[PDB]
Each structure stands twice: as C-alpha cells, then as structure tokens.
C-alpha cells in the first residue's frame, strides 16, 4: 500500500528541501539525509484532473523510468560492463496525500527567484498518489554551468565520460538515452584524478579534470534484458518532433529518421546523435573562464572540432569510444 509523505521525507529532511528543477509532470527538490545531499523527484499519478495543463501519468507510464533508473544505477556494481556515469538511485516510493506545506514553501521560493511554468501544487487532495524517486545528488546541470567551466580541457573530459557511460550501457543493456540534452547532464566536483570504467571486460580510465559527470532522466530511454524491451513509444507523439530554435529539437527528428519511427528497435546511433549535440554545445554555447590562449589549448580545441565534424560517421557510443582518435 502507499506510504505517507512522512516516510520519504521525515521532518528534518522535509525542512531542508530546496527546489532545483521542474517539468510538465514533476518537481525536483534537493534535501539532506545523514549529512549528504540527495535529489527527490515527485510525480503525481493516477488522478483524473489536470496538473500544469496536462493529464496525470499512470503508474504504468512511469514504470519504464523506474526500471531504467534502477538498471543504469546498478552498472556501478557490475563486472564486465561497469560505469558510475549514470545517477545513483537510492529509493522509489508510492506516496499518498496532499502536498506537504514544507514542499510548497520550497516551491514558492523557486517561483519568486527563478519563475515557474507550473501550477502551485497546493490543490492535491488526501487521496492523491505520487511516485517519489530519491537519487544521488549529481551536481549542477551542464546548461546551468554554461559560464562556469574552467576551459575546453574540461569539455573533453565531459565528452569522454559521457561516451564511456553510454558505451557501457550499450554493451550491457542495448541502451539508448534518447533525450540527452544539456539539462540532463550533471557535473559535480571530484577529488579523484581519474575515473574508472569497464567495457566488455576491459578496464580503462578517464582523466577527470576535477569533475564527475552523471547522466539523468530516462523518460524517453530504451533498453533490454533477455529480450524484454523497455521503452517509450512516441511514434504517435504530436509535438515531440515539431520543436525549433535549438539543434536539440532536430535530434528528435533525426532519431525518428534513423529508426523509421519504430521506437522498440535498437539504434545506438541515437547515442551518437546526442553526443554530437553535446559537442556542438561545448563548441558554440559554452563560454569558458580561460580561453585557448596557449598552443597546447588551441590543440585541444582543434581535437574537439575534429570530433564534432567526424563523430556522426560512427555507429554507436561503443564505436566512438573504441575507435575515435579523441580517446587515444
């Protein structure tokens, strides 16, 4: 049976909530438990009425994200195909009740400072169900770090980390992320000089440049285990393919072209498309604290430019990681 909000958010945890993100169907908060930050994603489910102008999702509709979140989190503890590049999943609960007054307070503070596109979540009744996903706190999204990175050497570590994580997930799970825009890439400081992964039993390292990248958000993602495929069928979606004003919105169309609008199939080229979009952001929209002033830094810039103009001729993140000159 469902639990009260108190189960996920005891008082001290609830009292420490700050809102960090939102979308059509959810709210994301940061809080603290045992001296450690975590991120809480809260989705209303199963009700007949509108939230932020759209119908609530059913449990069936959210289940794929729950499943995929868990499978990708478990890659940190695997052997042949091992990566910590996906966000850790701590717990998932089904909760019943009105929205806590303490979360409303957090919601109000975000609306005052950043502005919300969503309704104030104060209208839910005591029978309302929610899914509450608790994750590792992954740092700050790449979009919000547009003006905050040291140099293009950092961008290279970020791209290498992303390619490796995706390669490991391809190998283990026939994974496609399918929505890896720059709000779904998180950066956190790390003291580790290098990060470790294992791809089909071969272990390697990546220089961190002081950052650990985490991938999040699996609403559009696809994977499989023992031939059972978990994915989001967007073949009849009326607006996913009609966006404009950012290369991001072309990627949805280019995915649909690659897969012939058959979303259950495996087309790991979609991971390449997203990595090309990310590289394009690094070269065009990111602005660095230190530019490429030295010949050595101009060289890194040239290698990332070369990656950008060649990577679309690779068939998967695995092909990119194993064969592309950038990662030698």
């Amino acid at each position: 049976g469902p639990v009260p909000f108190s189960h996920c958010l005891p008082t001290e945890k609830l009292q420490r909530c700050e809102k960090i993100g939102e979308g059509v169907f959810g709210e994301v908060f940061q809080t603290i438990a045992d001296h450690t930050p975590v991120a809480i994603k809260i989705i209303a489910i199963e009700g007949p009425d509108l939230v932020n102008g759209s119908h609530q999702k059913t449990f069936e509709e959210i289940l794929p994200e729950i499943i995929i979140s868990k499978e990708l989190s478990l890659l940190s503890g695997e052997v042949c195909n091992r990566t910590e590049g996906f966000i850790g999943l701590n717990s998932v609960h089904c909760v019943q009740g009105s929205y806590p007054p303490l979360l409303l307070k957090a919601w109000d503070h975000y609306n005052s400072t950043k502005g919300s596109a969503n309704d104030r979540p104060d209208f839910f009744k005591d029978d309302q169900l929610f899914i509450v996903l608790e994750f590792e706190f992954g740092g700050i999204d790449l979009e919000q770090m547009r003006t905050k990175l040291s140099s293009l050497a950092t961008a290279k570590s970020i791209l290498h980390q992303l390619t490796a994580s995706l390669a490991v997930a391809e190998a283990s799970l026939r994974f496609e992320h399918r929505d890896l825009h720059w709000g779904n890439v998180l950066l956190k400081k790390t003291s580790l000089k290098k990060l470790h992964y294992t791809l089909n039993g071969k272990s390697s390292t990546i220089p961190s440049c002081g950052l650990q990248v985490s991938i999040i958000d699996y609403t559009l993602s696809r994977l499989e285990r023992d031939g059972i495929v978990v994915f989001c069928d967007v073949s009849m979606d009326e607006d996913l393919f009609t966006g404009d004003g950012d290369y991001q919105f072309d990627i949805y169309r280019l995915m649909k072209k690659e897969n012939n609008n058959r979303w259950g199939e495996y087309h790991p080229y979609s991971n390449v498309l997203w990595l090309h979009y990310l590289t394009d952001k690094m070269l065009k929209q990111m602005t660095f604290k230190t530019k490429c002033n030295t010949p050595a830094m101009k060289q890194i810039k040239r290698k990332i430019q070369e990656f950008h103009r060649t990577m679309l001729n690779f068939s998967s993140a695995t092909d990119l990681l194993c064969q592309h000159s950038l990662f030698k």
Binding site: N52, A117, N118, D179, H181, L240, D246, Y252
Partner: peptide, 7 residues
Amino acid sequence: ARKKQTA
C-alpha cells in the same frame, strides 16, 4: 530545454 513544455 525540456523536450515538452508547459506550454
């Protein structure tokens, strides 16, 4: 941006 927006 989010893939779908409120909106």
